[PDB]
Design a protein around this ligand. Sequence first.
Ligand SMILES: CN(Cc1cnc2nc(N)nc(N)c2n1)c1ccc(C(=O)N[C@@H](CCC(=O)O)C(=O)O)cc1
Ligand SMILES: CN(Cc1cnc2nc(N)nc(N)c2n1)c1ccc(C(=O)N[C@@H](CCC(=O)O)C(=O)O)cc1
Ligand SMILES: O=c1ccn([C@H]2C[C@H](O)[C@@H](COP(=O)(O)O)O2)c(=O)[nH]1
Ligand SMILES: O=c1ccn([C@H]2C[C@H](O)[C@@H](COP(=O)(O)O)O2)c(=O)[nH]1
Lengths: 264, 264
Amino acid sequence: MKQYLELMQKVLDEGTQKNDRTGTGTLSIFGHQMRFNLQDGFPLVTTKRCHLRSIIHELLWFLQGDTNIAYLHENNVTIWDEWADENGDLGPVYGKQWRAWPTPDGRHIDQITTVLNQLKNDPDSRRIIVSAWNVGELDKMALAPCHAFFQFYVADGKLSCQLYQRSCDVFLGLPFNIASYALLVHMMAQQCDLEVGDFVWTGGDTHLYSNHMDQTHLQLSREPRPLPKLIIKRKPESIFDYRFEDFEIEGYDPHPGIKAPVAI
Amino acid sequence: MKQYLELMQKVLDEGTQKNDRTGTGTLSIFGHQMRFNLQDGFPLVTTKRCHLRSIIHELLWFLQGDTNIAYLHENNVTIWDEWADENGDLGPVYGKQWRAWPTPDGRHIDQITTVLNQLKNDPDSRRIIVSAWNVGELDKMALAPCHAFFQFYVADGKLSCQLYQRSCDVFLGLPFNIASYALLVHMMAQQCDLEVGDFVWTGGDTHLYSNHMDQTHLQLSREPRPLPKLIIKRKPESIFDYRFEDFEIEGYDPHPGIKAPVAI
Ligand SMILES: CN(Cc1cnc2nc(N)nc(N)c2n1)c1ccc(C(=O)N[C@@H](CCC(=O)O)C(=O)O)cc1
Ligand SMILES: CN(Cc1cnc2nc(N)nc(N)c2n1)c1ccc(C(=O)N[C@@H](CCC(=O)O)C(=O)O)cc1
Ligand SMILES: O=c1ccn([C@H]2C[C@H](O)[C@@H](COP(=O)(O)O)O2)c(=O)[nH]1
Ligand SMILES: O=c1ccn([C@H]2C[C@H](O)[C@@H](COP(=O)(O)O)O2)c(=O)[nH]1
């Protein structure tokens, strides 16, 4: 995509060399923002083939409140294997925080449902937020949330969403992250009878790993194809009732895939 | 400031009229970002006179972990009077979350001490975050945190900071918020022997209240003057030992202040 490819070029143009947790090395910039008008098409990267099956399943898994990779495994998704323990557990990550953030007084807050109720009864609210950044539970998580905070907004009957990603692996992570959230916005809009607005992405430490340089330049030499279209074939009773089969992506003609190593 | 005035104009040109919580009505946009190179000077608005004493005392108050406006009154600061209760308390707002985030099991996390230690021991970390968005205590707060999430970053010996503000009153709140965070970066940089970098401001619902239009138009016709310079006269034993007496602003020649009512 145009915005995505411009971000890569920017990282290469004004990024600083930084050492990191993984010990790989990164080219990095701090602070960036880009907007995607969902009415223009589904933002799935076309300059390289993306695996939508894994994106959809991870999202349904998040919405279930699940943090064990069993579900992902029976659906042949292995993107989370490197961080899970002997029992397949990842700790109180995304899924748990979204559906059951623990309060100090013994309660548990379902942020997804509260957001659904806000979009319906108080769409003008400036507090329609979901956070995965639970300071008091970070030590129990296999990995600290990258996409850790997001806010919804309604205007002219359209639903918008802004995500704050503290750490961003521009080559591997980002294409997955954008499609993941664009899909959630579509599901939320269908449940609240709203049209799709903009998906605004904001990043903290936006980086490109040292071992992804050749792949990055290979992708940059490609011209983006027209954005695919998302067709939802059903309207479930709840946001938690979607199935993989309810989604149809048409007009997706990408450039060949480019393989790259993940930094654990 | 240049970029501040540009945002002010943007809200006027592209804002959507929304009936807000107060019932006053706003003109708003969703998703915006501004960068301030702190090496160029302290980002304190010159198109109108802003007062540093309220800004400085509120920040020191935050770092104390205090949530009662008693301290603020001793120093003639009244900004939190309309939201405080009969006893002067605001509930577990900013200060409490920064210094003593409560875990579900009764413990407390000192986000500021953690951040200090990360900057000093692991500067390349992509997890140097402070969050005031405690979902479990939101209902106990007099007002949900506006400037709710911030991340620090180190590169080339320079300290940068990005703040995520979910709701922003462009006229009254914004000038305060920017200067408040620019100040913290300076205190942090001094305590961690680093040079200052960029202050990145990211906003969600960025608005302009309808009863501030005349004041906005007035300010928009004033030419911005060169930015001031912040001088920290004494280096305390810790980040918690700063006093109002330690801060000085040189070369601040602003246009006269503009009065405007607050929407409670
Ligand atoms: C969201 N996710 C989890 C996750 C957790 N730790 C990480 N750690 C690093 N350093 N980078 C990541 N992107 C990453 N992301 C991902 C996303 C994509 C791939 C990945 O290998 N993607 C390939 C192949 C996808 C596939 O396996 O089918 C692609 O091009 O899409 C791995 C993990
Ligand atoms: C950061 N802060 C806290 C705070 C809490 N609730 C709010 N609620 C509303 N809607 N607006 C705010 N700006 C606001 N902000 C503020 C910021 C500015 C002023 C204020 O009135 N400031 C100057 C403004 C002077 C000027 O306009 O030039 C003054 O002394 O009157 C009050 C509280
Ligand atoms: O959805 C995701 C998950 C992870 N990452 C990346 C960010 C970092 O490259 C690495 C996590 O390392 P830390 O930032 O936690 O140190 O994984 C993404 O880009 N997207
Ligand atoms: O530091 C602050 C505190 C408050 N506000 C503003 C934002 C909104 O105008 C109002 C809070 O209202 P809600 O967004 O919670 O509705 O005060 C700021 O801009 N900055």
